[model samples]
Target: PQREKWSSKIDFVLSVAGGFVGLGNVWRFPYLCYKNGGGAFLIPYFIFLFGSGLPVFFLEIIIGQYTSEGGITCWEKICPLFSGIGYASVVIVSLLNVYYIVILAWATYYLFQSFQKELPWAHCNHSWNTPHCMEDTMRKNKSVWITISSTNFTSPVIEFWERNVLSLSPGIDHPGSLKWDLALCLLLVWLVCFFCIWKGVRSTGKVVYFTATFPFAMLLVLLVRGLTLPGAGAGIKFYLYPDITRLEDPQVWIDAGTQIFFSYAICLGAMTSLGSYNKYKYNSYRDCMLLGCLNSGTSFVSGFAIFSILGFMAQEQGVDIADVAESGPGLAFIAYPKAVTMMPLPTFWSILFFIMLLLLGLDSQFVEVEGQITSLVDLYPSFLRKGYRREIFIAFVCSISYLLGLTMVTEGGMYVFQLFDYYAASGVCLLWVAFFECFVIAWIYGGDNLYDGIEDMIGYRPGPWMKYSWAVITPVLCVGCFIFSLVKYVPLTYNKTYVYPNWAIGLGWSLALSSMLCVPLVIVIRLCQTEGPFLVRVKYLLTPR
Candidate 1:
């Protein structure tokens, strides 16, 4: 039986956008923008977006639409030897979803707390607050922002995150007792994910209607409110002020490239799997452009919303903007919550803010879960067919993922979360995967063939734009970024302390290579299986069908 197609192009667009515009936009991109060069980071960002990100993204979508198959099977039909790319996708996605759900679990915990009459993090009365807990309010001077009602203490929001919710263990060495609340939240995350995607695109498509659109609405609301705060202008100024000298650094470019991949949700077969459900003549070229534009724009706007609030927090705390600024998990859970606590009706804004985070996370969760489910259904249609069997399979996937994620809810889970983020989703892993994908598709399968396929569906070829990007520019940049990452590599550390043990670092690398090494391993196996001269087998194996 043929796999299910998206009910309409709008459904396809919304679903893809849901996957592309994720927590990375809100949490990661804003901080990258602030840290790299403020406004100047956009230079390398949009450059790679067009050159490397979009072309590879387009190639993945083309393969999916052209082949009408899931991620693993799509590679199989494209080139037999590279079928391992599909296998690699399964490994990475499985590993990713396990920890990815943990973020949503955190969001769930925060969301439930958002319903309180007075936000707990708004004051220093909680037991979690240490003797150092300080509460301050803002007073804007003629030119400078200053703090009043100051006391020598830590922010209540910090205590809420570090003490109350996480109860963060000493480090990865101590996998302490599970936080039962977080465990329940993790279970809820999996339950929500399972239902959202259990029916495949049929359910997923409808879910994206709100999941994709709500964040943008919430962002606008937050941005508007944030701009009205005392330090909003300062935060916006800090975020967008151009710093040209940082552009000279290689790391800046690497950061931009990595962010593009992260923002677009590429290289790990998420985009490819989502595209696989698209209709054959869906004009993915147009949808591709539209989605890319929306994604980049959202990231830019989200920075405004995020920094505006950070500015408010800094002013209220009588500190520098950079002091309150953080990235990744810290930015979302700590900085933003601290900012929210300072506002009127803290509970209302708190609920709204965490709800935004929850929705943002849930949207991406739907896609990753779908990618894993779609891969299985595509690989084994006979058993995991389109019926009760499929539902049961989804239930099993979600249940197992929930079980795997329980570790992340433990007192020591943050350490595990850091390791997973470092190993599975970091620069080197995806860069290699993307490099091979571009090399095989553009060079081996031939750029002209891909362009012709696009032309067949869209009525006009993309000409040199798509050709040079997919064939040359994208691959070279990917290789360059991968090499740069290796040279600049520092051992993974959590919070600039807690250096992972050698054994833990080894495990991290293993998690990365476990998926990445699939390509060459499969190549060797296929070469041995091929009955031909060595050179002939090499050529035959490398050749695209």
Candidate 2:
């Protein structure tokens, strides 16, 4: 059965935007803008966004629309050997979704907190006996632990899971066990993912109604409310305050580059997969450029919207914005919520914030799930083609994912989350994905021709800036990131400082390599089993995906 295309160009753009803006915009970006000298960080952020982020995004989209093949098969057409790059990307995106949703659950849990007359963590004087929310002992095994009303807004995101994350019993402190909460997070994440994709893009299209719009709405609300707060101006000033000194640290530059690349989903397989589904003449060059523009614009506009509010809160809290917000959790859970706590009508604002987060997280999750389902369905079309219901395939996919996700929701799931965050995405793993992508695109598929094709589609030549980005820029950025990932490595710290056994590290490499390596193997095997090597008897030595 033929699937429907997006209703219009703008519709497609909004769906893509929904996927692009995700957790990075709502949670991570805001905090970074404030913490890294607010407006000062934008200097590096935009620098990297143009140099690396936006260009790569356009490339992926162009590949998809030009070929009308997904991440998996698009490269195969370019060069049978290069198809593996697409496969690796799909896997990388999947692995990312596994843990990304866990964070979504955190926001969900807090959303539940919004409706209550008073927050459970707000008043420790209540019956639930606890002053501090630490469950270190529960970390030893898989369990969930919670101390009533023990959480602090300024508390480490790590501490929240360390204690209340997974507590089977009231365990003693090493760090509060979050084994249980993590499991719950996993379960919910998977369920949401499945729901969005089970019916394929048909379902996803509807879900985006709110997914694409809610965050923008919430951002506006938060910006307006945050700036108006008695002291938010100070927070905004702190956020915009340029610390040219921080630029001296190469690490800050990496932060800018990494965040831009990550936020735009550039070089990630998801955009490729999504684009592959578009019609071949969809004019992806424009789409790619537009995707980059809106994505970077949203992030910048959001910085203004986000920090303007933070300034007010800083003044009111009588604390430096830098002191209050950490780069990660502070943006979503703590900082915005702190504003809610200060507001006269706390419940309404809290409700709006979480709803915004929920929709934002879901849209991204929906895209991720759509990418996964499309790949699977496309893979087995020979079997699935016989009037086999896409809905049934979706159900099958969601059911399994849902069950696996519940494990994350369990007491010890946070440990797994920490392990994945530290090991799987440990900056090292992701950089490897980037290297493999560049190696495939730049070396294998006849690099300069990609832009030539884009020029044909758009009728305008790319300037030297884009050329530098493709040939020189992306690869260099990856190399630096690779070195930084290892040098600045923070070992996965579970209950015990789980020093990865030598074999464990070996296993880690194996996992990362497998995601990258499996693609080529799949292509080779597919060719071998089908027409075999007779087709590759050419002087160039090649075949198709």
Candidate 3:
């Protein structure tokens, strides 16, 4: 069977960018910037970006381009001893595929809500509202506001999220019934994902033309509007205010390093799968360098768009910028949406904002789902690659993921969502895969050979930094952060008030270890199957084919 190729270099580039630039760039990076050292965080971020992120990124791309195979099979061809690297990546991405789409579902629900005469979350007039729910105007009254400092008043936006949208369950153990509205939205997201990639790169390659480029247009529109709003300067100041002392904190460095890996989507094998579709002689070195820049550049620019609105929110509420600022779902669903309601022509802004979120999430989702499908077809080509078989397999996979995603759209689903978000694709798993990727490529496959492969394809030698990074710098940084993550580990919590039960905590660790354990598990199985004494088996397996 012939391998698929991206229709053109531009298609490949946009698909990669689409996969790399995701919700994290909009929500996570901006907050990390403010929380870490304001502007000072960029120093560690860029350092790690160059040191580990780009190196591992290039390594994965070259592996795929050279082998012309999907993620799982590529590792088998490169270093069979570490073939589990690919398996682990697929597992982690599968987990990610399940829960990550829930965010898109939430955004889709919000998008539908945006067409209302007034945004649903803007006032305390709905059935979901309680005595504790407060509108912006009510919070502004000096006498009523004084009690807010010492009491448990919730914002209209928070209530909308907790009650109207989620239908409030008490806790993880409650296991309330599913929210059919959200479930339907999840189905819509999954259907869109299925059609996007069921034809392989033939469809996905075309899809990225819009999904990849539209977010930037939205960002530009939002940035221009955000910058014009009152208090925009103050928000921008908070975003970039360099607290030089923040660099001294090890946690800040860890956050920067982890963000690079997370935002770049490293160690997930999606990059490798994307690279596999490139022509044999394609210059992925150049493409990867361009992507690294674009990924970080988008994150940097999005901070401006996000923080400016937050600044306006803070000023409108008569509070500090920090009071209104948040990250993750809070920023995406709560803070940003709340800010959008305050803008003139709020409905127009709401529609634009949710559409942007939907596209941003959809682009990343389809690419990742494609990566998983590519691996499956490569693994079982005899069964999956025949006529109509690929489409059926894709439907089968999407169905399973959608069923699993149902657990997350339940009334108690947010708690389960938090559980998966904390453990499934957490930093510890990513860094572990990253460290081994560098180690296996440099130590086993040999760094000199990788450079030779890159030069052969590109017709130009890469810099010395490539070798040094893969051999030493990247792995060391990965391990440093990996260890730091363990040392600073804490049990998962919900809304900073509800602690997950011990059983749920155990479930989280199992989810993490399920992926992380694949490497050694495969090694043991491979060695036991190989025909040799123990030492010879080890040596034979370690030697690249």
TM-score of 3: 0.92
RMSD of 2: 7.0
lDDT of 3: 0.81
TM-score of 1: 0.91
- Give the winner by lDDT: 1 or 2: 1
lDDT of 3 by residue, 342-433 (tens): 67899998898888888888888888888888887778887765678776888999999999999999998988887887677755677778
Q: State the lDDT of candidate 1 residue by residue for 295-332, as single tens digits.
A: 88988888787888888877766667765544436666
Error of 1 at 76 (Å): 2.0
Q: Please report, as a residue range, the 10-residue window in candidate 1 with the lowest summed lDDT.
A: 138-147
lDDT of 3 at 119: 87
**CA-lDDT, candidates in order:** 0.77, 0.61, 0.81
lDDT-sorted candidate list, best first: 3, 1, 2
- TM-scores, one per candidate: 0.91, 0.79, 0.92
Report the error of model 2 at residue 11, Å: 2.8
Per-residue lDDT over 1-545 for candidate 2, one digit per residue giving the tens place of the 0 to 100 score: 46456676766787688778778766667755554566567777877677767777777777776677667666767766455666776676666666677678877777665678875434334443244433222221233323323234333222332334333232221333334544555556566666556544566566666656677777777667766766656655666667888776555555566567567775456787767656655666666677777777767666665665555544433346665444443355655665566567778877887778777777887887777767766766777757667667766766665555554455545444444543443344455566666555566654676667767666666665665676777778778866765676534333333454455455556656667566657656655655535555322334334
Per-candidate clashes, comma-separated: 2, 52, 0
Q: How many clashing residue pairs, candidate 1?
A: 2
